[PDB]
């Protein structure tokens, strides 16, 4: 599909049994969600943006369904003010910018 | 052009006769550039950042050329990690997300 940018490019994603609304974010290197228990080991990480940094947990090889496309990769979990899909998963579903 | 996301979507812009690199950012409502001096009136503004609100200067109706595509709109100037082109100007240049 083609998603215009008049509005925030928000989509509902699925990880296991869980739905989240998340923003397709070409300005994010990484995918970050709030309020998510995920399976497996995790390591602390700090990620930055406008305003400064937040502390997150890094989980690897996590399946994320995005518009019928199956991504698998790193998901960060922490107090992000918006759930975010970053380039690490956008690339896997074949997402590009076009103008 | 078509810009893939294996690398940061950095492009050259021209603003006030200056060339700068900027990130095409679908996760940003607004365009925020690093500290620089711009034309005329500006309004003190606050934008919601990580950990709270950050002070920026708001300049309205500024011409910005992005990969040779013309936009005229609001540019914020303040402490950003990167020059960021947000949806306010991505829409003007006809930028979409596609997969």
């Amino acid at each position: 599909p083609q998603i215009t940018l008049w509005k925030r490019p928000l989509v509902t994603i699925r990880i296991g049994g869980q739905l989240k609304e998340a923003l397709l974010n070409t300005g994010a290197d990484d995918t970050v969600l709030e309020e998510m228990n995920l399976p497996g080991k995790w390591k602390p990480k700090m990620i930055g943006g406008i305003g400064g940094f937040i502390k997150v947990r890094q989980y690897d090889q996590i399946p994320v369904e995005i518009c019928g496309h199956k991504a698998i990769g790193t998901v960060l979990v922490g107090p992000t003010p918006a759930n975010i899909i970053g380039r690490n998963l956008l690339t896997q579903i074949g997402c590009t910018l076009n103008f | 052009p078509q810009i893939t996301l294996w690398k940061r979507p950095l492009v050259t812009i021209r603003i006030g006769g200056q060339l700068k690199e900027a990130l095409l950012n679908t996760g940003a409502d607004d365009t925020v550039l690093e500290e620089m001096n711009l034309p005329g009136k500006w309004k003190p503004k606050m934008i919601g950042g990580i950990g709270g609100f950050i002070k920026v200067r708001q300049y309205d109706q500024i011409p910005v050329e992005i990969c040779g595509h013309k936009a005229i709109g609001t540019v914020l100037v303040g402490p950003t990690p990167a020059n960021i082109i947000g949806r306010n100007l991505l829409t003007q240049i006809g930028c979409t997300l596609n997969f």
Partner: peptide
């Protein structure tokens, strides 16, 4: 690393 969300 940079997640440049912006509201």
């Amino acid at each position: 690393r940079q997640v440049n969300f912006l509201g």
